[PDB]
Amino acid sequence: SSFRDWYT
Amino acid sequence: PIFLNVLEAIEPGVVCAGHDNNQPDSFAALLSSLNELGERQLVHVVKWAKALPGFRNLHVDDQMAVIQYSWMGLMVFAMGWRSFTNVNSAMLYFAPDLVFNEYRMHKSRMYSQCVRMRHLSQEFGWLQITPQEFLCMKALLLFSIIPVDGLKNQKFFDELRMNYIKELDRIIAPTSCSRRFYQLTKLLDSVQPIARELHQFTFDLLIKSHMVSVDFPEMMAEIISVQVPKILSGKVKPIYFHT
Ligand SMILES: C[C@]12CCC(=O)C[C@@H]1CC[C@@H]1[C@@H]2CC[C@]2(C)[C@@H](O)CC[C@@H]12
């Protein structure tokens, strides 16, 4: 997910 | 008071919405600008959260999960505070370039919800809430919505939560120091049904967003479509102090 990747 | 130090230190500053105030107050523009703001304020919510005490002890999926579930309430609570402190609660201080008067409240088609948010704001005055109380309460709000079957590491979450409660207890730290606790727990509870209404509204909006020319930024659309429905469908629920 785009959130999963920004947050990591 | 090491915990306050942190909370005061990490508290995010002003965030402008990018709203063009020269254009008229269309439904599409107010809402696309609030969606932008949301995406902007989420950046700050994330950075803040990561720097909270104990937060990075949570399993990382839990971390992302609670942020994605609680952003609305957190963001609504902070906006209520800003409105209290900057416009003594006549209007809604979303961003310095996105202040809702009643006309905008009506044109957003969320007059109903905006009424509920203005109450929230008034309560900050009504109850004489200190800045330290706001901060401790706002942090608790991050830990106030969970999957009904639990998070990967639910035991670490309950402990953290417990600890944020004791801190609010501490900042309140025996008839006021108790009736006060009742009141703020009451005020915190009140955020949830307001966030519930906004989840319903935004989700509804995202679904019909080609029909009304409302732009949703990338991560907002993901969160509204994957996460928010878990709340709306009852898979994920607020934790209330009082039933
Ligand atoms: C969280 C935001 C944006 C940040 C803020 O200060 C509070 C505000 C509450 C209403 C939300 C909005 C983000 C955009 C939403 C979700 C719209 O889609 C409908 C309701 C809006």
Side-chain angles (χ1 to χ4, degrees), chain B residues 31 33-39 41 71-72 75-79 82 93-95 110 117 198-199 201-203 205-206 214 216 220 224:
Chain B
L31 267 297
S33 282
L34 279 176
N35 294 351
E36 185 54 23
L37 182 52
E39 174 91 345
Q41 279 191 21
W71 55 278
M72 194 62 74
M75 288 185 191
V76 163
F77 195 66
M79 185 273 284
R82 290 197 298 283
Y93 202 78
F94 288 109
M110 23 179 253
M117 293 189 277
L198 291 154
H199 290 319
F201 188 91
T202 197
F203 166 81
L205 187 54
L206 172 69
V214 162
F216 278 84
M220 286 287 295
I224 306 324

PDB file of all heavy atoms in Angstrom, chain B residues 31 33-39 41 71-72 75-79 82 93-95 110 117 198-199 201-203 205-206 214 216 220 224, ligand 1:
ATOM      1  N   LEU B  31     -14.368  21.081  -0.381  1.00  0.00           N
ATOM      2  CA  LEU B  31     -14.092  19.683  -0.085  1.00  0.00           C
ATOM      3  C   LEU B  31     -12.765  19.171  -0.629  1.00  0.00           C
ATOM      4  O   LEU B  31     -12.100  18.403   0.057  1.00  0.00           O
ATOM      5  CB  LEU B  31     -15.264  18.785  -0.510  1.00  0.00           C
ATOM      6  CG  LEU B  31     -16.268  18.531   0.632  1.00  0.00           C
ATOM      7  CD1 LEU B  31     -15.626  17.792   1.795  1.00  0.00           C
ATOM      8  CD2 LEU B  31     -16.851  19.865   1.103  1.00  0.00           C
ATOM      9  N   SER B  33     -10.177  21.070  -1.031  1.00  0.00           N
ATOM     10  CA  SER B  33      -9.222  21.738  -0.149  1.00  0.00           C
ATOM     11  C   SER B  33      -9.118  21.096   1.234  1.00  0.00           C
ATOM     12  O   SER B  33      -8.020  21.046   1.796  1.00  0.00           O
ATOM     13  CB  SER B  33      -9.544  23.208  -0.015  1.00  0.00           C
ATOM     14  OG  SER B  33      -9.098  23.915  -1.156  1.00  0.00           O
ATOM     15  N   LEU B  34     -10.236  20.582   1.757  1.00  0.00           N
ATOM     16  CA  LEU B  34     -10.241  19.832   3.042  1.00  0.00           C
ATOM     17  C   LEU B  34      -9.564  18.489   2.877  1.00  0.00           C
ATOM     18  O   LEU B  34      -8.859  18.036   3.772  1.00  0.00           O
ATOM     19  CB  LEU B  34     -11.669  19.624   3.586  1.00  0.00           C
ATOM     20  CG  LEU B  34     -12.419  20.731   4.363  1.00  0.00           C
ATOM     21  CD1 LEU B  34     -13.838  20.251   4.676  1.00  0.00           C
ATOM     22  CD2 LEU B  34     -11.708  21.115   5.662  1.00  0.00           C
ATOM     23  N   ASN B  35      -9.788  17.833   1.740  1.00  0.00           N
ATOM     24  CA  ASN B  35      -9.044  16.610   1.410  1.00  0.00           C
ATOM     25  C   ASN B  35      -7.543  16.838   1.330  1.00  0.00           C
ATOM     26  O   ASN B  35      -6.753  16.066   1.869  1.00  0.00           O
ATOM     27  CB  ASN B  35      -9.567  15.979   0.121  1.00  0.00           C
ATOM     28  CG  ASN B  35     -10.991  15.452   0.255  1.00  0.00           C
ATOM     29  OD1 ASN B  35     -11.565  15.397   1.365  1.00  0.00           O
ATOM     30  ND2 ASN B  35     -11.570  15.027  -0.892  1.00  0.00           N
ATOM     31  N   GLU B  36      -7.139  17.938   0.737  1.00  0.00           N
ATOM     32  CA  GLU B  36      -5.726  18.268   0.686  1.00  0.00           C
ATOM     33  C   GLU B  36      -5.185  18.418   2.102  1.00  0.00           C
ATOM     34  O   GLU B  36      -4.214  17.779   2.486  1.00  0.00           O
ATOM     35  CB  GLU B  36      -5.510  19.570  -0.106  1.00  0.00           C
ATOM     36  CG  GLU B  36      -4.040  19.949  -0.329  1.00  0.00           C
ATOM     37  CD  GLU B  36      -3.217  18.832  -0.987  1.00  0.00           C
ATOM     38  OE1 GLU B  36      -3.820  17.948  -1.657  1.00  0.00           O
ATOM     39  OE2 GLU B  36      -1.964  18.828  -0.812  1.00  0.00           O
ATOM     40  N   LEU B  37      -5.848  19.274   2.884  1.00  0.00           N
ATOM     41  CA  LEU B  37      -5.490  19.511   4.298  1.00  0.00           C
ATOM     42  C   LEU B  37      -5.309  18.211   5.083  1.00  0.00           C
ATOM     43  O   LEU B  37      -4.306  18.010   5.783  1.00  0.00           O
ATOM     44  CB  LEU B  37      -6.587  20.371   4.979  1.00  0.00           C
ATOM     45  CG  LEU B  37      -6.329  20.739   6.438  1.00  0.00           C
ATOM     46  CD1 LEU B  37      -4.958  21.359   6.584  1.00  0.00           C
ATOM     47  CD2 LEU B  37      -7.393  21.728   6.896  1.00  0.00           C
ATOM     48  N   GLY B  38      -6.298  17.349   4.964  1.00  0.00           N
ATOM     49  CA  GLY B  38      -6.264  16.050   5.562  1.00  0.00           C
ATOM     50  C   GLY B  38      -4.994  15.312   5.257  1.00  0.00           C
ATOM     51  O   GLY B  38      -4.421  14.704   6.165  1.00  0.00           O
ATOM     52  N   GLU B  39      -4.585  15.339   3.978  1.00  0.00           N
ATOM     53  CA  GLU B  39      -3.379  14.630   3.495  1.00  0.00           C
ATOM     54  C   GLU B  39      -2.132  15.301   4.071  1.00  0.00           C
ATOM     55  O   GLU B  39      -1.190  14.644   4.540  1.00  0.00           O
ATOM     56  CB  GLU B  39      -3.299  14.725   1.954  1.00  0.00           C
ATOM     57  CG  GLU B  39      -2.031  14.163   1.298  1.00  0.00           C
ATOM     58  CD  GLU B  39      -2.163  12.700   0.902  1.00  0.00           C
ATOM     59  OE1 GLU B  39      -3.117  12.032   1.369  1.00  0.00           O
ATOM     60  OE2 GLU B  39      -1.310  12.214   0.105  1.00  0.00           O
ATOM     61  N   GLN B  41      -2.160  17.151   6.913  1.00  0.00           N
ATOM     62  CA  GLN B  41      -2.145  17.024   8.398  1.00  0.00           C
ATOM     63  C   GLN B  41      -1.742  15.578   8.751  1.00  0.00           C
ATOM     64  O   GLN B  41      -1.183  15.313   9.800  1.00  0.00           O
ATOM     65  CB  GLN B  41      -3.501  17.448   9.057  1.00  0.00           C
ATOM     66  CG  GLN B  41      -3.717  18.947   9.247  1.00  0.00           C
ATOM     67  CD  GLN B  41      -4.911  19.267  10.112  1.00  0.00           C
ATOM     68  OE1 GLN B  41      -5.377  18.437  10.901  1.00  0.00           O
ATOM     69  NE2 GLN B  41      -5.420  20.486   9.979  1.00  0.00           N
ATOM     70  N   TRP B  71      -7.033   8.895  12.765  1.00  0.00           N
ATOM     71  CA  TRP B  71      -6.653  10.214  12.250  1.00  0.00           C
ATOM     72  C   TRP B  71      -7.825  11.204  12.309  1.00  0.00           C
ATOM     73  O   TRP B  71      -7.665  12.323  12.772  1.00  0.00           O
ATOM     74  CB  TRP B  71      -6.036  10.163  10.797  1.00  0.00           C
ATOM     75  CG  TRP B  71      -6.908   9.491   9.819  1.00  0.00           C
ATOM     76  CD1 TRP B  71      -7.024   8.169   9.631  1.00  0.00           C
ATOM     77  CD2 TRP B  71      -7.862  10.108   8.970  1.00  0.00           C
ATOM     78  NE1 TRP B  71      -8.036   7.895   8.702  1.00  0.00           N
ATOM     79  CE2 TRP B  71      -8.516   9.091   8.254  1.00  0.00           C
ATOM     80  CE3 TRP B  71      -8.204  11.425   8.712  1.00  0.00           C
ATOM     81  CZ2 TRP B  71      -9.496   9.361   7.324  1.00  0.00           C
ATOM     82  CZ3 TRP B  71      -9.148  11.686   7.774  1.00  0.00           C
ATOM     83  CH2 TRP B  71      -9.791  10.648   7.090  1.00  0.00           C
ATOM     84  N   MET B  72      -9.000  10.802  11.865  1.00  0.00           N
ATOM     85  CA  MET B  72     -10.166  11.710  11.899  1.00  0.00           C
ATOM     86  C   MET B  72     -10.370  12.379  13.255  1.00  0.00           C
ATOM     87  O   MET B  72     -10.490  13.590  13.326  1.00  0.00           O
ATOM     88  CB  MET B  72     -11.477  10.955  11.601  1.00  0.00           C
ATOM     89  CG  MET B  72     -12.688  11.822  11.277  1.00  0.00           C
ATOM     90  SD  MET B  72     -12.497  12.829   9.806  1.00  0.00           S
ATOM     91  CE  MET B  72     -12.653  11.612   8.511  1.00  0.00           C
ATOM     92  N   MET B  75      -7.531  14.541  14.291  1.00  0.00           N
ATOM     93  CA  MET B  75      -7.565  15.791  13.528  1.00  0.00           C
ATOM     94  C   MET B  75      -8.731  16.712  13.881  1.00  0.00           C
ATOM     95  O   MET B  75      -8.609  17.947  13.837  1.00  0.00           O
ATOM     96  CB  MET B  75      -7.608  15.498  12.032  1.00  0.00           C
ATOM     97  CG  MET B  75      -6.278  14.973  11.488  1.00  0.00           C
ATOM     98  SD  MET B  75      -6.348  14.782   9.690  1.00  0.00           S
ATOM     99  CE  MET B  75      -4.813  13.880   9.509  1.00  0.00           C
ATOM    100  N   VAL B  76      -9.882  16.120  14.143  1.00  0.00           N
ATOM    101  CA  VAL B  76     -11.063  16.877  14.562  1.00  0.00           C
ATOM    102  C   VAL B  76     -10.849  17.490  15.948  1.00  0.00           C
ATOM    103  O   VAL B  76     -11.191  18.642  16.155  1.00  0.00           O
ATOM    104  CB  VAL B  76     -12.305  15.980  14.585  1.00  0.00           C
ATOM    105  CG1 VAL B  76     -13.430  16.612  15.399  1.00  0.00           C
ATOM    106  CG2 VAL B  76     -12.743  15.696  13.160  1.00  0.00           C
ATOM    107  N   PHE B  77     -10.253  16.734  16.868  1.00  0.00           N
ATOM    108  CA  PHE B  77      -9.985  17.229  18.242  1.00  0.00           C
ATOM    109  C   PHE B  77      -9.040  18.444  18.214  1.00  0.00           C
ATOM    110  O   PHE B  77      -9.327  19.517  18.803  1.00  0.00           O
ATOM    111  CB  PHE B  77      -9.407  16.082  19.106  1.00  0.00           C
ATOM    112  CG  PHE B  77      -9.419  16.357  20.600  1.00  0.00           C
ATOM    113  CD1 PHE B  77     -10.607  16.470  21.295  1.00  0.00           C
ATOM    114  CD2 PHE B  77      -8.246  16.481  21.295  1.00  0.00           C
ATOM    115  CE1 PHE B  77     -10.620  16.729  22.657  1.00  0.00           C
ATOM    116  CE2 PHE B  77      -8.243  16.739  22.648  1.00  0.00           C
ATOM    117  CZ  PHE B  77      -9.433  16.849  23.336  1.00  0.00           C
ATOM    118  N   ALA B  78      -7.945  18.312  17.454  1.00  0.00           N
ATOM    119  CA  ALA B  78      -7.000  19.424  17.294  1.00  0.00           C
ATOM    120  C   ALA B  78      -7.615  20.618  16.589  1.00  0.00           C
ATOM    121  O   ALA B  78      -7.292  21.763  16.892  1.00  0.00           O
ATOM    122  CB  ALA B  78      -5.742  18.967  16.554  1.00  0.00           C
ATOM    123  N   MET B  79      -8.448  20.379  15.591  1.00  0.00           N
ATOM    124  CA  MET B  79      -9.117  21.504  14.952  1.00  0.00           C
ATOM    125  C   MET B  79     -10.085  22.219  15.925  1.00  0.00           C
ATOM    126  O   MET B  79     -10.314  23.424  15.803  1.00  0.00           O
ATOM    127  CB  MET B  79      -9.880  21.029  13.746  1.00  0.00           C
ATOM    128  CG  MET B  79     -10.519  22.156  12.960  1.00  0.00           C
ATOM    129  SD  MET B  79     -12.160  22.629  13.559  1.00  0.00           S
ATOM    130  CE  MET B  79     -13.098  21.244  12.898  1.00  0.00           C
ATOM    131  N   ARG B  82      -7.850  24.618  18.108  1.00  0.00           N
ATOM    132  CA  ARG B  82      -7.472  25.770  17.279  1.00  0.00           C
ATOM    133  C   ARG B  82      -8.591  26.774  17.082  1.00  0.00           C
ATOM    134  O   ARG B  82      -8.325  27.952  16.970  1.00  0.00           O
ATOM    135  CB  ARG B  82      -7.063  25.333  15.867  1.00  0.00           C
ATOM    136  CG  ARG B  82      -5.759  24.586  15.769  1.00  0.00           C
ATOM    137  CD  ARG B  82      -5.218  24.557  14.327  1.00  0.00           C
ATOM    138  NE  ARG B  82      -6.089  23.868  13.367  1.00  0.00           N
ATOM    139  CZ  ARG B  82      -6.188  22.543  13.260  1.00  0.00           C
ATOM    140  NH1 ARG B  82      -5.494  21.750  14.072  1.00  0.00           N
ATOM    141  NH2 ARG B  82      -7.019  22.003  12.369  1.00  0.00           N
ATOM    142  N   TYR B  93     -11.770  26.646  12.680  1.00  0.00           N
ATOM    143  CA  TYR B  93     -10.396  26.964  12.247  1.00  0.00           C
ATOM    144  C   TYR B  93      -9.634  25.710  11.670  1.00  0.00           C
ATOM    145  O   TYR B  93      -8.671  25.176  12.230  1.00  0.00           O
ATOM    146  CB  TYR B  93      -9.650  27.639  13.388  1.00  0.00           C
ATOM    147  CG  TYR B  93      -8.443  28.476  12.981  1.00  0.00           C
ATOM    148  CD1 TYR B  93      -8.597  29.742  12.454  1.00  0.00           C
ATOM    149  CD2 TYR B  93      -7.145  28.009  13.172  1.00  0.00           C
ATOM    150  CE1 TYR B  93      -7.494  30.515  12.102  1.00  0.00           C
ATOM    151  CE2 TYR B  93      -6.039  28.774  12.818  1.00  0.00           C
ATOM    152  CZ  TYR B  93      -6.226  30.031  12.292  1.00  0.00           C
ATOM    153  OH  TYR B  93      -5.146  30.797  11.933  1.00  0.00           O
ATOM    154  N   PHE B  94     -10.092  25.254  10.520  1.00  0.00           N
ATOM    155  CA  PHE B  94      -9.436  24.120   9.868  1.00  0.00           C
ATOM    156  C   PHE B  94      -7.975  24.384   9.568  1.00  0.00           C
ATOM    157  O   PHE B  94      -7.139  23.586   9.893  1.00  0.00           O
ATOM    158  CB  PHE B  94     -10.179  23.796   8.614  1.00  0.00           C
ATOM    159  CG  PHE B  94     -11.494  23.164   8.855  1.00  0.00           C
ATOM    160  CD1 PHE B  94     -12.668  23.857   8.609  1.00  0.00           C
ATOM    161  CD2 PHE B  94     -11.562  21.851   9.286  1.00  0.00           C
ATOM    162  CE1 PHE B  94     -13.901  23.225   8.785  1.00  0.00           C
ATOM    163  CE2 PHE B  94     -12.767  21.217   9.451  1.00  0.00           C
ATOM    164  CZ  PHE B  94     -13.949  21.897   9.200  1.00  0.00           C
ATOM    165  N   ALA B  95      -7.681  25.572   9.061  1.00  0.00           N
ATOM    166  CA  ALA B  95      -6.318  25.969   8.640  1.00  0.00           C
ATOM    167  C   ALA B  95      -6.385  27.470   8.576  1.00  0.00           C
ATOM    168  O   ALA B  95      -7.499  27.997   8.504  1.00  0.00           O
ATOM    169  CB  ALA B  95      -6.002  25.389   7.237  1.00  0.00           C
ATOM    170  N   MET B 110     -21.964  19.791   4.928  1.00  0.00           N
ATOM    171  CA  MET B 110     -21.759  19.090   6.190  1.00  0.00           C
ATOM    172  C   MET B 110     -22.094  19.995   7.367  1.00  0.00           C
ATOM    173  O   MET B 110     -21.356  20.051   8.360  1.00  0.00           O
ATOM    174  CB  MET B 110     -20.366  18.466   6.311  1.00  0.00           C
ATOM    175  CG  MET B 110     -19.245  19.040   5.479  1.00  0.00           C
ATOM    176  SD  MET B 110     -17.775  18.082   5.902  1.00  0.00           S
ATOM    177  CE  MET B 110     -16.927  19.310   6.877  1.00  0.00           C
ATOM    178  N   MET B 117     -18.979  19.734  15.563  1.00  0.00           N
ATOM    179  CA  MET B 117     -17.601  20.139  15.796  1.00  0.00           C
ATOM    180  C   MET B 117     -17.465  21.488  16.525  1.00  0.00           C
ATOM    181  O   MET B 117     -16.516  21.712  17.306  1.00  0.00           O
ATOM    182  CB  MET B 117     -16.877  20.185  14.455  1.00  0.00           C
ATOM    183  CG  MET B 117     -16.715  18.804  13.841  1.00  0.00           C
ATOM    184  SD  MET B 117     -15.656  18.760  12.377  1.00  0.00           S
ATOM    185  CE  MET B 117     -16.809  19.259  11.117  1.00  0.00           C
ATOM    186  N   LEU B 198     -18.178  11.670  10.124  1.00  0.00           N
ATOM    187  CA  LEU B 198     -17.290  12.153   9.117  1.00  0.00           C
ATOM    188  C   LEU B 198     -16.751  10.989   8.281  1.00  0.00           C
ATOM    189  O   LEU B 198     -16.508  11.148   7.092  1.00  0.00           O
ATOM    190  CB  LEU B 198     -16.166  12.968   9.750  1.00  0.00           C
ATOM    191  CG  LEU B 198     -16.724  14.284  10.320  1.00  0.00           C
ATOM    192  CD1 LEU B 198     -15.900  14.852  11.457  1.00  0.00           C
ATOM    193  CD2 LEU B 198     -16.924  15.311   9.197  1.00  0.00           C
ATOM    194  N   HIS B 199     -16.581   9.828   8.903  1.00  0.00           N
ATOM    195  CA  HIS B 199     -16.161   8.663   8.165  1.00  0.00           C
ATOM    196  C   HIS B 199     -17.226   8.288   7.137  1.00  0.00           C
ATOM    197  O   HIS B 199     -16.940   8.022   5.956  1.00  0.00           O
ATOM    198  CB  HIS B 199     -15.971   7.482   9.103  1.00  0.00           C
ATOM    199  CG  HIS B 199     -14.799   7.602  10.010  1.00  0.00           C
ATOM    200  ND1 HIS B 199     -13.581   8.088   9.593  1.00  0.00           N
ATOM    201  CD2 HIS B 199     -14.635   7.237  11.297  1.00  0.00           C
ATOM    202  CE1 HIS B 199     -12.717   8.023  10.591  1.00  0.00           C
ATOM    203  NE2 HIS B 199     -13.336   7.523  11.643  1.00  0.00           N
ATOM    204  N   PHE B 201     -19.554  10.267   5.978  1.00  0.00           N
ATOM    205  CA  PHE B 201     -19.624  11.341   4.969  1.00  0.00           C
ATOM    206  C   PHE B 201     -18.493  11.238   3.913  1.00  0.00           C
ATOM    207  O   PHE B 201     -18.747  11.294   2.709  1.00  0.00           O
ATOM    208  CB  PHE B 201     -19.579  12.699   5.658  1.00  0.00           C
ATOM    209  CG  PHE B 201     -19.835  13.839   4.725  1.00  0.00           C
ATOM    210  CD1 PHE B 201     -21.130  14.319   4.531  1.00  0.00           C
ATOM    211  CD2 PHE B 201     -18.798  14.399   3.999  1.00  0.00           C
ATOM    212  CE1 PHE B 201     -21.381  15.362   3.655  1.00  0.00           C
ATOM    213  CE2 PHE B 201     -19.041  15.440   3.122  1.00  0.00           C
ATOM    214  CZ  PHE B 201     -20.330  15.929   2.959  1.00  0.00           C
ATOM    215  N   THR B 202     -17.247  11.081   4.373  1.00  0.00           N
ATOM    216  CA  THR B 202     -16.101  11.100   3.460  1.00  0.00           C
ATOM    217  C   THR B 202     -16.095   9.866   2.565  1.00  0.00           C
ATOM    218  O   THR B 202     -15.722   9.919   1.410  1.00  0.00           O
ATOM    219  CB  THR B 202     -14.737  11.218   4.176  1.00  0.00           C
ATOM    220  OG1 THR B 202     -13.713  11.621   3.227  1.00  0.00           O
ATOM    221  CG2 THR B 202     -14.314   9.924   4.816  1.00  0.00           C
ATOM    222  N   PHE B 203     -16.500   8.744   3.137  1.00  0.00           N
ATOM    223  CA  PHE B 203     -16.570   7.510   2.399  1.00  0.00           C
ATOM    224  C   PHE B 203     -17.648   7.651   1.341  1.00  0.00           C
ATOM    225  O   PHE B 203     -17.389   7.430   0.157  1.00  0.00           O
ATOM    226  CB  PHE B 203     -16.905   6.380   3.341  1.00  0.00           C
ATOM    227  CG  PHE B 203     -17.314   5.137   2.648  1.00  0.00           C
ATOM    228  CD1 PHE B 203     -16.352   4.277   2.135  1.00  0.00           C
ATOM    229  CD2 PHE B 203     -18.661   4.830   2.486  1.00  0.00           C
ATOM    230  CE1 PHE B 203     -16.732   3.108   1.502  1.00  0.00           C
ATOM    231  CE2 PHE B 203     -19.050   3.657   1.849  1.00  0.00           C
ATOM    232  CZ  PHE B 203     -18.082   2.794   1.356  1.00  0.00           C
ATOM    233  N   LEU B 205     -18.552  10.270   0.075  1.00  0.00           N
ATOM    234  CA  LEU B 205     -18.099  11.282  -0.865  1.00  0.00           C
ATOM    235  C   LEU B 205     -17.114  10.723  -1.889  1.00  0.00           C
ATOM    236  O   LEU B 205     -17.155  11.058  -3.058  1.00  0.00           O
ATOM    237  CB  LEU B 205     -17.438  12.423  -0.095  1.00  0.00           C
ATOM    238  CG  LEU B 205     -17.040  13.672  -0.893  1.00  0.00           C
ATOM    239  CD1 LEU B 205     -18.216  14.215  -1.671  1.00  0.00           C
ATOM    240  CD2 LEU B 205     -16.496  14.737   0.041  1.00  0.00           C
ATOM    241  N   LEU B 206     -16.207   9.894  -1.409  1.00  0.00           N
ATOM    242  CA  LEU B 206     -15.196   9.266  -2.244  1.00  0.00           C
ATOM    243  C   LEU B 206     -15.818   8.366  -3.300  1.00  0.00           C
ATOM    244  O   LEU B 206     -15.348   8.318  -4.441  1.00  0.00           O
ATOM    245  CB  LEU B 206     -14.234   8.445  -1.390  1.00  0.00           C
ATOM    246  CG  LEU B 206     -13.252   7.585  -2.211  1.00  0.00           C
ATOM    247  CD1 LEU B 206     -12.243   8.472  -2.947  1.00  0.00           C
ATOM    248  CD2 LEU B 206     -12.573   6.526  -1.341  1.00  0.00           C
ATOM    249  N   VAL B 214     -14.823  16.308  -6.832  1.00  0.00           N
ATOM    250  CA  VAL B 214     -14.052  16.419  -5.583  1.00  0.00           C
ATOM    251  C   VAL B 214     -12.820  15.536  -5.715  1.00  0.00           C
ATOM    252  O   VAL B 214     -12.946  14.342  -5.973  1.00  0.00           O
ATOM    253  CB  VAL B 214     -14.880  15.985  -4.340  1.00  0.00           C
ATOM    254  CG1 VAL B 214     -13.977  15.685  -3.153  1.00  0.00           C
ATOM    255  CG2 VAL B 214     -15.899  17.057  -3.966  1.00  0.00           C
ATOM    256  N   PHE B 216      -9.553  13.636  -4.280  1.00  0.00           N
ATOM    257  CA  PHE B 216      -9.005  13.013  -3.096  1.00  0.00           C
ATOM    258  C   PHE B 216      -7.543  12.694  -3.392  1.00  0.00           C
ATOM    259  O   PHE B 216      -7.258  12.015  -4.372  1.00  0.00           O
ATOM    260  CB  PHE B 216      -9.737  11.718  -2.777  1.00  0.00           C
ATOM    261  CG  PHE B 216     -11.033  11.888  -2.025  1.00  0.00           C
ATOM    262  CD1 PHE B 216     -12.210  12.166  -2.697  1.00  0.00           C
ATOM    263  CD2 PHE B 216     -11.091  11.683  -0.653  1.00  0.00           C
ATOM    264  CE1 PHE B 216     -13.415  12.282  -2.013  1.00  0.00           C
ATOM    265  CE2 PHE B 216     -12.283  11.786   0.033  1.00  0.00           C
ATOM    266  CZ  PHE B 216     -13.448  12.084  -0.643  1.00  0.00           C
ATOM    267  N   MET B 220      -5.214   9.570   1.089  1.00  0.00           N
ATOM    268  CA  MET B 220      -6.544   9.764   1.611  1.00  0.00           C
ATOM    269  C   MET B 220      -7.530   8.767   0.982  1.00  0.00           C
ATOM    270  O   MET B 220      -8.267   8.081   1.704  1.00  0.00           O
ATOM    271  CB  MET B 220      -6.960  11.227   1.438  1.00  0.00           C
ATOM    272  CG  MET B 220      -6.247  12.129   2.437  1.00  0.00           C
ATOM    273  SD  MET B 220      -6.779  12.049   4.211  1.00  0.00           S
ATOM    274  CE  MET B 220      -8.434  12.664   4.037  1.00  0.00           C
ATOM    275  N   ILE B 224      -9.477   5.904   3.003  1.00  0.00           N
ATOM    276  CA  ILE B 224     -10.935   5.983   3.020  1.00  0.00           C
ATOM    277  C   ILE B 224     -11.583   4.716   2.467  1.00  0.00           C
ATOM    278  O   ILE B 224     -12.678   4.356   2.867  1.00  0.00           O
ATOM    279  CB  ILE B 224     -11.491   7.196   2.231  1.00  0.00           C
ATOM    280  CG1 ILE B 224     -10.885   8.549   2.665  1.00  0.00           C
ATOM    281  CG2 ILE B 224     -13.006   7.288   2.365  1.00  0.00           C
ATOM    282  CD1 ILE B 224     -10.582   8.679   4.130  1.00  0.00           C
TER     283      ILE B 224
HETATM  284  C1  LIG C   1      -9.867  15.742   8.808  1.00  0.00           C
HETATM  285  C2  LIG C   1     -10.285  17.055   8.156  1.00  0.00           C
HETATM  286  C3  LIG C   1      -9.011  17.791   7.713  1.00  0.00           C
HETATM  287  C4  LIG C   1      -8.113  18.269   8.865  1.00  0.00           C
HETATM  288  C5  LIG C   1      -8.897  19.008   9.943  1.00  0.00           C
HETATM  289  O1  LIG C   1      -8.425  20.012  10.498  1.00  0.00           O
HETATM  290  C6  LIG C   1     -10.250  18.458  10.325  1.00  0.00           C
HETATM  291  C7  LIG C   1     -11.049  17.991   9.104  1.00  0.00           C
HETATM  292  C8  LIG C   1     -12.360  17.372   9.557  1.00  0.00           C
HETATM  293  C9  LIG C   1     -13.229  17.153   8.330  1.00  0.00           C
HETATM  294  C10 LIG C   1     -12.559  16.202   7.354  1.00  0.00           C
HETATM  295  C11 LIG C   1     -11.187  16.768   6.958  1.00  0.00           C
HETATM  296  C12 LIG C   1     -10.483  15.915   5.881  1.00  0.00           C
HETATM  297  C13 LIG C   1     -11.346  15.822   4.631  1.00  0.00           C
HETATM  298  C14 LIG C   1     -12.695  15.211   4.973  1.00  0.00           C
HETATM  299  C15 LIG C   1     -12.491  13.724   5.358  1.00  0.00           C
HETATM  300  C16 LIG C   1     -13.735  15.279   3.884  1.00  0.00           C
HETATM  301  O2  LIG C   1     -13.552  14.259   2.898  1.00  0.00           O
HETATM  302  C17 LIG C   1     -15.063  15.094   4.655  1.00  0.00           C
HETATM  303  C18 LIG C   1     -14.800  15.452   6.133  1.00  0.00           C
HETATM  304  C19 LIG C   1     -13.384  16.036   6.073  1.00  0.00           C
END
